[PDB]
Amino acid sequence: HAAGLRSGTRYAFSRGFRKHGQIPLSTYLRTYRVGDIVDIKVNGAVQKGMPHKFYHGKTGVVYNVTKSAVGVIVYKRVKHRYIEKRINVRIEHVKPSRSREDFLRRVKENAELKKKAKAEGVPVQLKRQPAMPREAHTVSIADNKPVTLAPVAYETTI
């Protein structure tokens, strides 16, 4: 029984199948600013500035920007309390997250719906709501007549 820095990371830090060799260069052209929402995903082919196996899959907030790395804040759960960890990760392991993208899209339409509606003169009904039960309707049997079913007898297939 041992506990090393990469214990039990046989399948996590591996690259996929038929994904080996060159790293797509579009990774190095993104830009980050403090307050952005990023998520960590480690790449096995780069051994410098890589995070411990616990943060592989978590999501955090950038708080510092450096030459080739960013500082991220994430929340760890020790027994009966949370702690905030500050880790340094190279940009090859990070990616911008689409978690808040839906929120930003929705707020823009909400503003403009409210503006347009105020000029016209009809209430808004802007905030969303869950899926309500269906409503009544009619179904015709013209050119679609029902077919009668029945359970089937038993028989051996092999």
Place this chain on the structure above:
Amino acid sequence: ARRPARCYRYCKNKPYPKSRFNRGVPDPKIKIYDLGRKRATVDDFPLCVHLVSNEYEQLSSEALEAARICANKYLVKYAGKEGFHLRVRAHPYHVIRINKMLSCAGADRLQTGMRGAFGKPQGTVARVDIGQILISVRTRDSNRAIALEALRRCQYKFPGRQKIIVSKNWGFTPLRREEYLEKKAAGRVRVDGAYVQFLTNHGNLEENMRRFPDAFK
């Protein structure tokens, strides 16, 4: 001095095949798996009968080989050495262990009791499931009664419960009798040694028309 078969009947451990980790396992008792005219064509023996299991247990290699002999004896005597083909379709790959006590409970050195009780290999055994097939026999249409009795007599050497089912296919092929009959008449069938191959209309024309000349007329 093998232990009674009551002692290894339920699947209680993960599979344990022989590999570069456990070395020194005794060779399985059964080695032969095919008997009879194991080179007959598919058109000679159109009747197939199977012996299917009905529980989730373990069958030992020793038991399998003993059952094999019984079926062979009966068929040869009443149907002839040249009238059937029998195949056993269950291979033992699971290794069962044993912990030797009294012989390992010596005065000199070592430890007596339940201290460090990982065992040593002791034999092999086969895992079966519900609906799995154990023994198959193909023969002519006039050996129905002979085939049925052979398997019925064979089953008395296995623990548990098994059934006998007369199949609806042609020989050992996964085709029903009517479908195989009419498809062969169409000509998309090529005879091979003891088996057949089928047409697929996805290759290239030159090679396909050589192999299956009768499909194009």
Place this chain on the structure above:
Amino acid sequence: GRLQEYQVIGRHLPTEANPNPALYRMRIFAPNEVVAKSRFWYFLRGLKKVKKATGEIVSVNVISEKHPLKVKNFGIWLRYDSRSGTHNMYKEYRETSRVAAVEAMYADMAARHRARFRSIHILKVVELEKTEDVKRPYIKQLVAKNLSFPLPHRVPKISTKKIFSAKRPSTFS
């Protein structure tokens, strides 16, 4: 229980690639119109790729007997589970209504084969049209010409709280 025959109509939810799906009709014996729908979904899940979360229920109606004061012979085709496999069955009954036949069949199977309600499928029920297509002997005896039979040794009924009778009863009633 106390059963009744329902017709149940169901459908797959319409979609953009397939509006107006097909309609499936079944006849189901059930005590009320709640287990009626459940039995429908159970039988449909085994024939076609439709759930209930992705389907809907079109209609549910009650079928009543057409002549509940006429006696008729029935034949039933069914399948059931034993403790060691599955089998097919065919039995016959003599009464005045289809619903009772299902009532009688359930009691008979549970008694003679220890088959609960969980494991029985009703393939088909049909009333025998003529008299010459009756097969089982325990009903052929009941359609003989000029039937008549006495009833010997029938106990009389006495109040279960009238203890200490004063004379010997008699069974020749």
Place this chain on the structure above:
RNA sequence: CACAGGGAUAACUGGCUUGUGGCGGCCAAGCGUUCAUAGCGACGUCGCUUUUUGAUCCUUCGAUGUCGGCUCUUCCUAUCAUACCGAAGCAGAAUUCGGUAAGCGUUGGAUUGUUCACCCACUAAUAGGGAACGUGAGCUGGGUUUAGACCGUCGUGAGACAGGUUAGUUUUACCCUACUGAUGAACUCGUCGCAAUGGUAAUUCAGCUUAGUACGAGAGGAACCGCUGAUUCAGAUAAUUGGU
């Protein structure tokens, strides 16, 4: 050799398990001159019991006296003999396989502390087991297992050895219950009776005749009835014999 503690932890009974030990089945390649099942049974497989030995440590360490033998009662059947029967490669005789059956028996000695064992001899037979591995306020103390002492191997030494040998204190019942017997108040004192319930008892062999017969080529060689005795056990008695 000592102290404080531990059933948180071993050596014996008891409890769960049954590998090993013991006992019984199912299929049938074959043995049996020919013939699978008179009598057996390979290769496989399903069980039962707690009189062998293991595994665990649940109960007792302010203590349940720890080998064997002697005496005594009762219980189980997986039946050695005794009663009556069914099968055979059962002519007779001698035998082998099975059933109903635990009522009645199952020995005397040489060697060893022995449990275990092996010889001599009689007998119808000399079957297997339990009861806190029955039984120490019932006995004995041959062995193990305190202190004395000798030898051999080991250790420089004190000392060690499930290696051999010799000598070594065995305590208390008047209490409660159980058992064997003996009195006894109440309805006046007596004599003669009935019988609910509880207990229960007999056992085996030998000689004569059947008979040199049935059976069998011969060698050999039975049985019921009848008659007279004897072994083990039980209840009494003292004229004769013996003991005191």
Place this chain on the structure above:
RNA sequence: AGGUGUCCUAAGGGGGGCUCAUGGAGAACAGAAAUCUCCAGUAGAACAAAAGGGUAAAAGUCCCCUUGAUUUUGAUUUUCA
């Protein structure tokens, strides 16, 4: 099922050219195997060591130059109070 109490002035650092194991076909002694040539060859070779991950105009291989194996203190990660 196995491994550690070591080893390295290069087996560290930078730059540059090349591609491997193996198979097919040929060439005096030469052959099963010595050296040379063409074609195919997704890593089936190599990377000090146990096993896993990673690497192809390289992280392998050959060539050129060096000592970031240097000075001053702080922040953060895994085992974790």
Place this chain on the structure above:
RNA sequence: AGACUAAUCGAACCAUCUAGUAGCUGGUUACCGCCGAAGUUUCCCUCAGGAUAGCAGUGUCGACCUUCAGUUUUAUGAGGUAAAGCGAAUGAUUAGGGACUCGGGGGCGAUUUUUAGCCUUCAUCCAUUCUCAAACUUUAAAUAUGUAAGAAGCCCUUGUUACUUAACUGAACGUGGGCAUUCGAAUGUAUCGACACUAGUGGGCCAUUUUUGGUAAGCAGAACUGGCGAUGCGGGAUGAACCGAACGCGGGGUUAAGGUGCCGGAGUGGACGCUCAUCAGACACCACAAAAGGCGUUAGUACAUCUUGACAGCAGGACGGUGGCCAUGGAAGUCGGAAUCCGCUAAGGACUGUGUAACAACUCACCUGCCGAAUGUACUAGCCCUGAAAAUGGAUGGCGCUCAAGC
């Protein structure tokens, strides 16, 4: 002899140090009310013990801030288990076929054989085929898991810098203004945040599901959750862990698990069937029984036969070539080997048994005479039976129960 030295000796007796130390046994004194646990993480010559964190009590303070949540919805990330796969890589593994001879071996054509000859047995390629992987994989669930759902928000203009850019081009922090009429999913808020001081505990055990060693165990060791310990009450006759349900003192009403022939409060209640046991059976955890058999009885599946007269019963026949070929002391159907034809038919086997040294003789298969209608065979699963042997007398709780008071 570790013997004796005042009943004391493997180190006498008397007083003092001395109330000598103990991580170890034993005890620890009136009532009511409110709250209410742990046997777990890290370190210790630590394992019968301590410190540390956790669980708990009391005292408060900041607002009554309106924030929160062992939960759901919507949007968006990570995983390599169950399953599946091997005519897909690695590894294991059964069998034929085609192509090849100079890869090996055994023959033949003159073993000629250094003949690309005829055979073939391995081996090698190609298209197929029967089974597997806790330390294999191209794929890939269910259950659980990270983040977000705004006023501390969104948009517009332009001030600061010793940083950065060729550069007022950027980055952070800002001034000013605009956008609420509706602050931007559901439900709840019978309980919001912070601080101080300290008690006990640090031997645990049981259960569904997942699961490791072991033949197995009322055995040893783990994960999520629920219990006993620390807890009474109704049911399982009895029993810490099971089912129902958690508790101030009383009166009335209704139920849960469980029951209604008596013991025992309430049906000898109703409908359809199955079972006769010279060992019946009788309610989850639970106090046990299997493989294999039955012409006991009930229900079902399939196939075959039949007024051109079946199954059963009684009665008749049961022929020739031909004692077929070999085999050998002799074997004429009947020790054994290999063949398996015809004649006459109403019918008869180069044979089913008994039998002889061999014959003979008997019988069977097959057909026919009599009768007057439906049978014959092989399988499936319900209750019952055989399989079923232990020690004081005995336990479906007891008595008892048979169109049940059993299933």
